[PDB]
Design a binder for this molecule. Sequence first.
Ligand code: MET
Ligand code: K
Ligand code: K
Ligand code: K
Ligand code: K
Ligand code: K
Ligand code: K
Ligand code: K
Ligand code: K
Ligand code: K
Ligand code: MG
Ligand code: MG
Ligand code: MG
Ligand code: MG
Ligand code: MG
Ligand code: MG
Ligand code: MG
Ligand code: MG
Ligand code: MG
Ligand code: MG
Ligand code: MG
Ligand code: MG
Ligand code: MG
Ligand code: MG
Ligand code: MG
Ligand code: MG
Ligand code: MG
Ligand code: MG
Ligand code: MG
Ligand code: MG
Ligand code: MG
Ligand code: MG
Ligand code: MG
Ligand code: MG
Ligand code: MG
Ligand code: MG
Ligand code: MG
Ligand code: MG
Ligand code: MG
Ligand code: MG
Ligand code: MG
Ligand code: MG
Ligand code: MG
Ligand code: MG
Ligand code: MG
Ligand code: MG
Ligand code: MG
Ligand code: MG
Ligand code: MG
Ligand code: MG
Ligand code: MG
Ligand code: MG
Ligand code: MG
Ligand code: MG
Ligand code: MG
Ligand code: MG
Ligand code: MG
Ligand code: MG
Ligand code: MG
Ligand code: MG
Ligand code: MG
Ligand code: MG
Ligand code: MG
Ligand code: MG
Ligand code: MG
Ligand code: MG
Ligand code: MG
Ligand code: MG
Ligand code: MG
Ligand code: MG
Ligand code: MG
Ligand code: MG
Ligand code: MG
Ligand code: MG
Ligand code: MG
Ligand code: MG
Ligand code: MG
Ligand code: MG
Ligand code: MG
Ligand code: MG
Ligand code: MG
Ligand code: MG
Ligand code: MG
Ligand code: MG
Ligand code: MG
Ligand code: MG
Ligand code: MG
Ligand code: MG
Ligand code: MG
Ligand code: ZN
Lengths: 305, 110, 150, 154, 59
Amino acid sequence: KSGTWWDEHLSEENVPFIKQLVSDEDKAQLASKLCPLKDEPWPIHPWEPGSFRVGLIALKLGMMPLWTKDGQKHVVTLLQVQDCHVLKYTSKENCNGKMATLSVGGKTVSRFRKATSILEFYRELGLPPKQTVKIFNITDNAAIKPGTPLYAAHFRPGQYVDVTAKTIGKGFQGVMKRWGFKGQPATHGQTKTHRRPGAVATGDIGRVWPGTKMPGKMGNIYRTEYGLKVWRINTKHNIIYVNGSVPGHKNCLVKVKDSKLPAYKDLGKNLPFPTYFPDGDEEELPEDLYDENVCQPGAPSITFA
Amino acid sequence: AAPKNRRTIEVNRCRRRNPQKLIKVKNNIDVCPECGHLKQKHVLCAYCYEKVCKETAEIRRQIGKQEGGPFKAPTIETVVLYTGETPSEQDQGKRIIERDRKRPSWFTQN
Amino acid sequence: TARGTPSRFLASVLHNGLGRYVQQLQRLSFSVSRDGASSRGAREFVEREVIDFARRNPGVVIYVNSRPCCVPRVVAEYLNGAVREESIHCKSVEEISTLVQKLADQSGLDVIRIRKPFHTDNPSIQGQWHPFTNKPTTFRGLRPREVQDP
Amino acid sequence: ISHGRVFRRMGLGPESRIHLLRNLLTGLVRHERIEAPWARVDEMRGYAEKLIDYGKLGDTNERAMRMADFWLTEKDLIPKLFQVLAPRYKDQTGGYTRMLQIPNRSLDRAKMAVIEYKGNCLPPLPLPRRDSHLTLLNQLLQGLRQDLRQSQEA
Amino acid sequence: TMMERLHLFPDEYIPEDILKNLVEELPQPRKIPKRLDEYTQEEIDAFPRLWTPPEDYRL
RNA sequence: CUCGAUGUUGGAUCAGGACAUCCCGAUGGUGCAGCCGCUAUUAAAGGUUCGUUUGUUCAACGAUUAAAGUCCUACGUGAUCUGAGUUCAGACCGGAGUAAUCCAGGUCGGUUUCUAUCUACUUUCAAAUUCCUCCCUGUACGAAAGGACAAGAGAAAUAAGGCCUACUUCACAAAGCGCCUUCCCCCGUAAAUGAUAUCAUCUCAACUUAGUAUUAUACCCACACCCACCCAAGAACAGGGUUUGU
RNA sequence: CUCUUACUUUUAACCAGUGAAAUUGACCUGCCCGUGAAGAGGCGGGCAUAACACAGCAAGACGAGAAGACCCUAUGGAGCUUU
RNA sequence: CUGAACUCCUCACACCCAAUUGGACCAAUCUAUCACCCUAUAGAAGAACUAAUGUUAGUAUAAGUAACAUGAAAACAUUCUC
RNA sequence: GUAAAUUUAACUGUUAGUCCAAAGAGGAACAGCUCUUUGGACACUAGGAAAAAACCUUGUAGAGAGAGUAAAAAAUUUAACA
RNA sequence: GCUACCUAAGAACAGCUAAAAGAGCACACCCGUCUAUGUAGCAAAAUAGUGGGAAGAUUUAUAGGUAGAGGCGACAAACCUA
Ligand code: MET
Ligand SMILES: [K+]
Ligand SMILES: [K+]
Ligand SMILES: [K+]
Ligand SMILES: [K+]
Ligand SMILES: [K+]
Ligand SMILES: [K+]
Ligand SMILES: [K+]
Ligand SMILES: [K+]
Ligand SMILES: [K+]
Ligand SMILES: [Mg+2]
Ligand SMILES: [Mg+2]
Ligand SMILES: [Mg+2]
Ligand SMILES: [Mg+2]
Ligand SMILES: [Mg+2]
Ligand SMILES: [Mg+2]
Ligand SMILES: [Mg+2]
Ligand SMILES: [Mg+2]
Ligand SMILES: [Mg+2]
Ligand SMILES: [Mg+2]
Ligand SMILES: [Mg+2]
Ligand SMILES: [Mg+2]
Ligand SMILES: [Mg+2]
Ligand SMILES: [Mg+2]
Ligand SMILES: [Mg+2]
Ligand SMILES: [Mg+2]
Ligand SMILES: [Mg+2]
Ligand SMILES: [Mg+2]
Ligand SMILES: [Mg+2]
Ligand SMILES: [Mg+2]
Ligand SMILES: [Mg+2]
Ligand SMILES: [Mg+2]
Ligand SMILES: [Mg+2]
Ligand SMILES: [Mg+2]
Ligand SMILES: [Mg+2]
Ligand SMILES: [Mg+2]
Ligand SMILES: [Mg+2]
Ligand SMILES: [Mg+2]
Ligand SMILES: [Mg+2]
Ligand SMILES: [Mg+2]
Ligand SMILES: [Mg+2]
Ligand SMILES: [Mg+2]
Ligand SMILES: [Mg+2]
Ligand SMILES: [Mg+2]
Ligand SMILES: [Mg+2]
Ligand SMILES: [Mg+2]
Ligand SMILES: [Mg+2]
Ligand SMILES: [Mg+2]
Ligand SMILES: [Mg+2]
Ligand SMILES: [Mg+2]
Ligand SMILES: [Mg+2]
Ligand SMILES: [Mg+2]
Ligand SMILES: [Mg+2]
Ligand SMILES: [Mg+2]
Ligand SMILES: [Mg+2]
Ligand SMILES: [Mg+2]
Ligand SMILES: [Mg+2]
Ligand SMILES: [Mg+2]
Ligand SMILES: [Mg+2]
Ligand SMILES: [Mg+2]
Ligand SMILES: [Mg+2]
Ligand SMILES: [Mg+2]
Ligand SMILES: [Mg+2]
Ligand SMILES: [Mg+2]
Ligand SMILES: [Mg+2]
Ligand SMILES: [Mg+2]
Ligand SMILES: [Mg+2]
Ligand SMILES: [Mg+2]
Ligand SMILES: [Mg+2]
Ligand SMILES: [Mg+2]
Ligand SMILES: [Mg+2]
Ligand SMILES: [Mg+2]
Ligand SMILES: [Mg+2]
Ligand SMILES: [Mg+2]
Ligand SMILES: [Mg+2]
Ligand SMILES: [Mg+2]
Ligand SMILES: [Mg+2]
Ligand SMILES: [Mg+2]
Ligand SMILES: [Mg+2]
Ligand SMILES: [Mg+2]
Ligand SMILES: [Mg+2]
Ligand SMILES: [Mg+2]
Ligand SMILES: [Mg+2]
Ligand SMILES: [Mg+2]
Ligand SMILES: [Mg+2]
Ligand SMILES: [Mg+2]
Ligand SMILES: [Mg+2]
Ligand SMILES: [Mg+2]
Ligand SMILES: [Mg+2]
Ligand SMILES: [Zn+2]
């Protein structure tokens, strides 16, 4: 009845062996999916207006500045794609919604810390378990066979994307930090009232309205940044350079999807559909893809003339 | 502020006997193989640790007798010897602490 | 009140009165005091009333025990096994006779609330109502919006 | 918001925290095995590891002597650091101390830990040992390991 | 609880399980009036003409 | 109703609501040329400044603004705060009184308690508002003076939500003074076609158009390793990682 | 102050020991509108509604505390002044 | 058609107003005399408490809450920090 | 048509009043306002007007798993013209 | 035995400036201006900081005196065992 862990009863000799055994299997499983187009891929339909493709799951490495050809400085966030595979496809009828859903995972983690139901789900799929799984709403023509790897070349420079991740949790916070209340003065007589909310309601109602701003847990919730331009794509390390900042701390897993803003609708004509297949590409892409206005590091100095 | 009304025993029993306030049964209790007494998986055995501390206390008392005062820490290594034992080749040049008892089985000589 | 007291349904003992009527009272035990002032009415009942009462109830055995007692009592035992003890303390001869006659006419069941002032083992003769009692049948028993021979 | 804070808040302040760890560290060097609350031992453990590194710099190093002078309140332990403890771990690049949790203190039910320098003359602690290789689970894994090596050679 | 026994469907579609356990169809409370084009010629002929329009009226 | 107590101005804080609308939106009329106005219908989503004097609500004044709206909320809110005013005990001045003492007269000073039992509440919406500049254009309009709207482009402010590459307070990180992102509609009327009433008539006549969204979409989404350790997770609990368990 | 932020200590929260006080008709202790001794958790019409901890908040329980000090009443007192 | 404690129906009947007033009974206690598993007839009186911010005692509630405490290691010798 | 009334003897309590209808006065042909008069109701029961002291129905008391009734539900939709 | 004032006989007041001081700066000491905390508190008037005085009408130990129709009071209707 006592709880157990994977290496509780293992001897001194077995622990290095078990770690090597599972680690080698994970690398073999990931290497077996490197050629999706040679393992009976699903039909690839051409892109059509109104079609929505799948996104990726990326890890927020950090932020880095870049400069454009007009001299302006833009700070971008590096999002690295780490072991991103399509996990499950659900048909439009079975999704209970208006569109078919495609499940995507990322950041392969240990099998010893996952539930049995999850472990057997990945055993059939033949992939190591993923830390985070996100559901993407797609059209029928954008369906991708489960187990297909996803790479940062799925996006291209000049594209606008949306990034969703859990924000940095600041714990239980007062109204001054959580809601930006002005608080009370520091001097002139104030008695034990400097950061307090003050009045919370009127005297007539005799109750606090639901949804009133009060101290409580701050952050640690999912937020989305819309209209983040993609400036640079690093195909070697699978890194996406998205404009500005994205929610969440560094080394966190984010959800990258094509922007839903109306201004960027139907801009996927030149984007890969349903995704990017490096194995089937006729000519290998260069290491770094730059936007037309990005000053590359090897470019000469900016001269206004 | 003061209570508006007295809280009944029926209300009090629900708060006091809530499972959040009840003691949780521990499942990490196991028998120590060396002595047979109980111990936790991540915690050293109380019986065995006391056994080591009792011998450690005796050794430290003998150390103080040789030092004979404060600020008398030697600049050489220390070796503990028991009855019927002699210093070895690797123990030459080290401070010798003699205990007037047979060497414990669990205290392996090095 | 009704909620704070037990309840039962109206019933009889061995279906009394169906084939024949059997007096449910079985035994009466009187305790009178020779000198007790509170037993004056009880002594009057024994002198002239209990002898005639025994004639009219040959099936009831009456025990009159004369012993010192402050509160005279009469104990009534019935065929079903119920025992009821009633006090005749400072009661006149007429009141005792009414009380004794009341005990003889009772069936011995508990004097508590009776849910229904009637009882019947055959409440229905033509058949108890069920939802299909007044529902006509359809050809081939077809349900609404059902297609036959698809 | 204690994000990224690696130093505990103990004692009466920052200076009192150092003095509390220094007294524990000084006691650790003299006796080579001390017991204290778990949090204080864990906080002090990092300093004990780096104290030996300064000992390996040699007593001729002025900076090492100054660091040893501050952290050893009893000056007889300074020769011990540079001539006993430091030569002891000459062939070790780390792991100078082992920290183990002991039952809670009797008085205040505080979480207690024991920390010692490896290689001391004191009787060994009842170190936790993994299951023997001859157990049923380990025998099955050993047979699996032999099979893989045989197949790899073939 | 009573609402849990109430099943509402926007159109003529009803689940097969719900259909298989139906018993009786209640009559509709309101009689649906027939449109002008739903009347048969016999009914139209039955209703008499009430007035004689002028022959020279454009209508 | 309350004197075996329902605590008063004004301010701070947080604001809930009404529309009899100050600004922004859509319209009718004009003694509406245009630019500015006046008046009326419709609209409560959003916004509605900083200061000198005064305890002030006001008011006056300075500089702005698309605008610096009117009211209700126990004159919203003192178990959140302030105590300048007001309103005890001290004192002064003028006045009334023989005096004690008094004066919606002024003036100086003058204790603002409460450890939350109950109700309610403690991440609602993840669609944004507005100004200015350039351009249209010195065009429409007008004798001249003067001088647009619509479309398009750009740059800001505020608000909401995040973030730490740099700057800055700082330094394993938290922050702003810094950076990033921010998306639908508003019904008043103006017009056709055409009956009652064979013209006409925008229609609580049948009907057509400006004219409308099942607010679109997005977010969330699997589950005993779990004794223990770590954590960008956290009051506790929970949650993430341990293939980083000497 | 514009306009707040960071860290330390105390407090805090959790664990162990010891263990108060005002308060308390009974409570199985919701919201809206209406009503009513004129401001309802308990009444009327609706709406909402498995159970039970922990930490916050101070809109309400006309919250707790002090048989209102203001005001008036009493053929109830008292200090002071006086033709 | 529904609809009262109105009225009728079966049985019974002193058995729904504040202040106040009249009347019929009665718990327990003591005494006279009875009674003798707890009563009777009378005479007596410290003769009956869901309420006085009542008095005294017991124990709850708020509450296991507020609050309170021991510098560190060690051989308990001693040393160290402030 | 009815069964009360006065007198005699012995006392207590009530003597701080609310709404409705009606005739008036004061105010403002204001007040859940104030003051009189006539009557009702309330400070007693029950039903009804939603909740409801004062409007309506109805009073003399108990039991019933009978019955007839009393008061008792809000109606309304409009601008052509020679 | 607190406090108001008084009586007898005692004690304390560093350093600096000026050297004359109900003089200045400033410890001990006396007092309690302002603010925060505290408000069943450490305290039935305190803590922390900042302040007034500090050779004088100073502060203070001991014993004694004045007692309620009163005492005492550099008048605050002060103080006379919270
Ligand atoms: C009016 O001012 C009244 N509240 C009296 C204030 S002093 C007790
Ligand atoms: K009052
Ligand atoms: K508004
Ligand atoms: K002022
Ligand atoms: K309550
Ligand atoms: K017309
Ligand atoms: K800062
Ligand atoms: K409150
Ligand atoms: K004190
Ligand atoms: K004296
Ligand atoms: Mg956090
Ligand atoms: Mg501030
Ligand atoms: Mg103050
Ligand atoms: Mg205070
Ligand atoms: Mg403060
Ligand atoms: Mg209220
Ligand atoms: Mg931390
Ligand atoms: Mg501490
Ligand atoms: Mg009260
Ligand atoms: Mg205010
Ligand atoms: Mg508001
Ligand atoms: Mg309007
Ligand atoms: Mg309106
Ligand atoms: Mg607007
Ligand atoms: Mg016009
Ligand atoms: Mg107010
Ligand atoms: Mg309040
Ligand atoms: Mg106020
Ligand atoms: Mg004042
Ligand atoms: Mg004067
Ligand atoms: Mg006056
Ligand atoms: Mg002052
Ligand atoms: Mg004043
Ligand atoms: Mg106060
Ligand atoms: Mg306060
Ligand atoms: Mg509070
Ligand atoms: Mg909560
Ligand atoms: Mg324009
Ligand atoms: Mg912000
Ligand atoms: Mg026509
Ligand atoms: Mg025509
Ligand atoms: Mg026309
Ligand atoms: Mg026309
Ligand atoms: Mg677990
Ligand atoms: Mg607390
Ligand atoms: Mg108490
Ligand atoms: Mg009490
Ligand atoms: Mg309940
Ligand atoms: Mg409830
Ligand atoms: Mg109300
Ligand atoms: Mg209700
Ligand atoms: Mg709570
Ligand atoms: Mg109160
Ligand atoms: Mg209040
Ligand atoms: Mg009073
Ligand atoms: Mg007065
Ligand atoms: Mg008076
Ligand atoms: Mg009088
Ligand atoms: Mg008198
Ligand atoms: Mg009836
Ligand atoms: Mg009846
Ligand atoms: Mg009767
Ligand atoms: Mg009796
Ligand atoms: Mg008697
Ligand atoms: Mg008595
Ligand atoms: Mg009692
Ligand atoms: Mg009492
Ligand atoms: Mg308790
Ligand atoms: Mg505790
Ligand atoms: Mg509490
Ligand atoms: Mg505490
Ligand atoms: Mg302390
Ligand atoms: Mg201490
Ligand atoms: Mg009289
Ligand atoms: Mg009146
Ligand atoms: Mg009258
Ligand atoms: Mg009365
Ligand atoms: Mg009613
Ligand atoms: Mg009757
Ligand atoms: Mg003298
Ligand atoms: Mg001097
Ligand atoms: Mg002087
Ligand atoms: Mg003194
Ligand atoms: Mg003095
Ligand atoms: Mg001076
Ligand atoms: Mg005397
Ligand atoms: Mg004096
Ligand atoms: Mg005076
Ligand atoms: Mg005075
Ligand atoms: Zn053991």
